[model samples]
Target chain A: DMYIERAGDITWEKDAEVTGNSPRLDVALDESGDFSLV
Target chain B: GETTDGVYRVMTRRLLGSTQVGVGVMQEGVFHTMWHVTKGAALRSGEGRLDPYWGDVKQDLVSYCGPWKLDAAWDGLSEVQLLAVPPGERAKNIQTLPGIFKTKDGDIGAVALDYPAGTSGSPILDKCGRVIGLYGNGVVIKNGSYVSAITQGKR
Candidate 1:
């Protein structure tokens, strides 16, 4: 497992601990709600 | 979607039978805005009829089609195969090639992939040779990546 501290200027909220071995990432959006990856 | 004389402009999705679906690209627009199917009768002798398997269903004709089968086991481990005929060909020559597949956050059925020049609306196939989605557009940059997103079809 790893933690996301920052990417460029985007900083992680709290520790943002990334766990699990799954390949898919879960994301949320406003206008579209749950966004489709493809 | 604009159309000119002698050019086909509209594309429609319809049930070919119980097992397969068909798409028709036409020079004319669909006149009926809504279609309905009932039990025990054929909607038409030829095209544009709902199969009896979908009993008593009503659908709007704004723009839609298909329940094309999708491969559920796909993960983004490899590239996907694509099949389609580019625009401006008279003989309907089908072409095939390999395209890039990208990973997204969820199992939305749709996936983004690359297409060769002049290819659109092509069928995107998984590594197992099953159709997972259909090509929707050409190359575009989304979130700093070049992607041609394929829209998911049916089940």
Candidate 2:
């Protein structure tokens, strides 16, 4: 089984332009495939 | 709208309940969000759409409604591991480390050091190995530099 090794590596990219408060972020998965928001 | 084998389809929807407790995951490629609306909800038709609030993606909502049961032993756990099967995989994997439960905006939430890629709707488990929360999106903090961590919703 493939296990997640680290945290804060995956980044979320906004799909559209935002004007105010949005939960979306602009990031992508890292080399290890971990997720991050900033 | 999207179709799957009957058995696998049945398996997924059984994960939800009328209590508004359910799990969600992103579909591979197109990124449509799938929901597991357990049978206890007794929802008819089992079809719906969701406007994903976290990102700018429109989801092709697919839900399954059927009798799904989960072990309730982990109800009050303070820490648990995360489990998920990445996109294009059939085997489920566990995170190497555990996440700590914390109060977020007055609700119980879990924070992990890292989560597997494509694990937004994965299940968070307790030390005794029971599901406690559903993994949500990650959060990044900026202090001139960016830092990130995984967050989840309590079940």
Candidate 3:
């Protein structure tokens, strides 16, 4: 989950959550529609 | 408000084919462009066409005949295993798709390779060192032609 305005490490917004997981990686969709790599 | 950067190249990978197995560079208009064969390993049986299967885990582990740069931004990357690291090895990995042929009595197959994207940093030296066109999906095998269809669903 995430929220952003410009480039630089940002925070997640409300209702943002990551879905699905891979063996080596995890992917998520933030409320703001940005992706996050954990 | 939109933030603007000066002069962008728009680096991106184009998803081609139904499965994410095939991806090409971002050009425009044309459906066909330089694509990366994400299938880790392929098989050719009884003069049959080589069907690309993802993560063969055996023969499929190979580096791009082109340079690593060509693979930039592409996902589904496998661990780098060099076929060249061993003696008597021409390449560090299996870079070519093997062809299977059918004979009158039975059938035989061989792995014929196209010029790799780049050869060991030597640079492919054509079309700015990027892979151009390559063999088609349906291949000629034995006395008949076989179509190597893309398997549906995500890997």
Q: By lDDT, who's the top model here? A: 2
Q: Measured by TM-score, how close is model 3 to the native structure?
A: 0.17
lDDT of 2 by residue, B1-155 (tens): 33221111112323332122223432221111223223122222234432223221111122222112222333333433444434434424343333322322232333433433444445544545444434544444463322222333211
Q: Indicate the fraction of true inter-chain contacts that candidate 3 also forms.
A: 0.00
By lDDT, the better pick of 1 and 2 is 2
Angstrom error of the Cα, residue B59, model 3: value is 29
The C-alpha stretches of model 2 lying farther than 4 A from their native spots are A1-38, B1-63, B66-78, B90-92, B95-104, B113-117, B142-155
Instruction: Compute fnat per model.
Output: 0.00, 0.03, 0.00
Q: Choose 1 or 2, whichever is better by DockQ.
A: 2
Candidate 2's C-alpha lDDT?
A: 0.31
- In what order do the candidates fall by lDDT, top score first? 2, 1, 3
- Mark the regions of model 3 whose C-alpha exceeds 4 Å error after superposition: A1-38, B1-21, B28-30, B33-111, B114-127, B135-155
Provide the clash count, candidate 3.
15
Candidate 2 chain B weakest ten by summed lDDT: B4-13
lDDT (10s digit) by residue, model 3, range B74-113: 1122211112111112222323222333323332222222
Residue B135 lDDT, candidate 2, scale 0-100: 53
lDDT of 1: 0.29
TM-score of chain B of 1: 0.38
| Candidate 1 residue pairs in backbone clash | B67-B154, B68-B154
Which 10 consecutive residues of model 2 chain A have the lowest summed lDDT? Answer: A1-10
